[PDB]
Write a protein that binds this ligand. Structure first.
Ligand SMILES: CNc1cc(N2CCC3(CC2)CN(c2ccc(CN4CCC(C)(C)CC4)cc2)C(=O)N3)ncn1
Ligand SMILES: [Mg+2]
Lengths: 198, 243
């Protein structure tokens, strides 16, 4: 089901095995460094490994999480094979931890298994784009990911409303209910949650 | 600008613009700088503890095999075996050029091995405004085209931006942007500053440069030490010199 799907929930307690396998996982976790953050143990124990057999993981990291995210990434079964940085600009295309001012955000890229059928090499590891709203990830990464893995199943973790995208199941607590359309997924969700409450 | 790079060959960063008077600090740094010293040594084969005293800042630019992906390469196995912690002052800083591959991970292992923690990740973002249609061969493991290098900053113990935009050097040129030195010098971290694997082309006031490819040496441990004997021992690099 190409159209956008989402599941409002606590990712700590939702059973992600219902959701099946994905060619791309993306997460912008709330690291423990204005909202609820997960401690380092809660992050290591997330059930990333059931989500993929062969494919890619996109992991936003900031501050201390550049080291922890590398840890979670290895713990979950991935090798880091690239790192995207987003240079943040304004509408005039100029540039906008405590030692330097941070004019970028980092996204680790991890590989798992033997992903096959991917157009690696189509984009740069630099994104340039205007900072939309505070704590909003930039739309260009979805395009980058789409060119990498055209028409495949993808899932975002700790998404916010505006993160919903075709071919993407978004998970996140600031979402509205449970919008599911892929038949294999509405099936496993009804078998695992008959009364619909995590 | 990412659907544009895939179309026209211009990297997203080719379009960043502009890439008060903090000038007085520069004067203070320049008045404070020791004369340049330099020493040819093969660092593989050289006890680093002979480099004395202990350094306030270490800039570490080992020649990675990846720098010559077109034209003696050090491996992260070799780098990791250097005993940087033996020449670092108890409170001191390191800036390590990590490349864009395994080095972003193996470089953090090194930082921790030597007793630092990373507090800054500085990115050298390389534009291709003079050769858009020159897409590079990729690392086997690479998903994306790599258009940047990282320089990790580490502290042990107790103004600027974390980006450097310049044009990609001509293949086979390995120089790092000289702006790394400005970022470093603007931090005011101490006057004992060491560049390992520097070259003749990187020699610079206020710095001791050690490297196998230097053509001349003027290193003298005693002469070097005299620059920091009292009342010059604890200057930041950015202050009035002591009368
Ligand atoms: C208790 N467990 C939970 C919790 C949960 N949510 C948690 C709350 C969220 C929504 C989802 C997350 N977030 C959020 C804010 C800031 C960042 C940092 N980033 C850096 C990278 C970036 C610039 C591209 C974007 C910003 C990253 C994330 C929210 O503002 N709100 N969903 C399920 N279970
Ligand atoms: Mg300067």
């Amino acid at each position: 089901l190409f159209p956008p799907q989402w599941i409002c929930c606590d990712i700590r307690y939702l059973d992600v095995s219902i959701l099946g396998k994905f060619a791309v996982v993306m997460a912008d976790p709330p690291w423990d460094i204005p909202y609820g953050t997960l401690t380092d143990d809660e992050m290591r124990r997330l059930n990333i490994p059931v989500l993929q057999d062969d494919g890619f993981l996109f992991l936003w990291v900031t501050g201390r999480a550049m080291e922890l995210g590398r840890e979670c990434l290895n713990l979950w079964g991935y090798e880091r094979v690239d790192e995207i940085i987003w240079v943040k600009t304004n509408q005039l295309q100029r540039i906008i931890g405590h030692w330097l001012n941070h004019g970028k955000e980092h996204c680790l890229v991890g590989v798992k298994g033997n992903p096959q059928g991917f157009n690696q090499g189509l984009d740069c590891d630099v994104i340039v784009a205007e900072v939309r709203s505070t704590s909003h990830k930039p739309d260009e990464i979805y395009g980058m990911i789409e060119r990498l893995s055209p028409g495949t199943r993808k899932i975002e973790l700790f998404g916010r409303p505006h993160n919903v995208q075709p071919n993407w199941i978004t998970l996140g607590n600031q979402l509205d209910g449970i919008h599911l359309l892929d038949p294999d997924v509405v099936a496993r969700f009804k078998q695992r949650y008959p009364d619909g409450i995590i | 600008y990412c659907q544009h790079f895939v179309d026209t060959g211009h990297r997203p960063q080719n379009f960043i613009r502009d890439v008060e008077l903090i000038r007085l600090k520069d004067e203070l740094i320049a008045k404070s700088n020791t004369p340049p010293m330099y020493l040819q040594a093969d660092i593989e084969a050289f006890d680093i503890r002979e480099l004395t005293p202990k350094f306030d800042v270490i800039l570490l630019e080992p020649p990675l095999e990846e720098y010559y992906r077109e034209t003696k390469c050090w491996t992260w196995d070799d780098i990791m075996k250097l005993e940087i912690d033996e020449i670092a002052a108890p409170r001191s800083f390191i800036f390590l050029w990590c490349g864009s591959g395994e080095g972003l991970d193996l470089g953090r292992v090194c930082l921790r091995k030597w007793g630092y923690r990373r507090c800054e990740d500085i990115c050298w973002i390389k534009t291709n405004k003079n050769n858009p249609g020159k897409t590079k061969t990729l690392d086997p493991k690479a998903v994306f085209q790599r258009t940047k290098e990282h320089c990790l900053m580490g502290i042990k113990g107790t103004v600027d931006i974390d980006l450097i935009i310049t044009e990609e050097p001509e293949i086979g040129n390995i120089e790092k942007p000289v702006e790394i030195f400005h970022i470093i010098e603007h931090f005011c971290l101490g006057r004992r500053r060491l560049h390992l694997f520097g070259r003749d082309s990187t020699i610079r006031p206020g710095w001791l440069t050690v490297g196998p490819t230097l053509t001349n040496s003027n290193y003298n441990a005693e002469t070097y030490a005299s620059y920091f004997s009292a009342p010059n021992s604890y200057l930041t690099g950015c202050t009035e010199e002591i009368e």
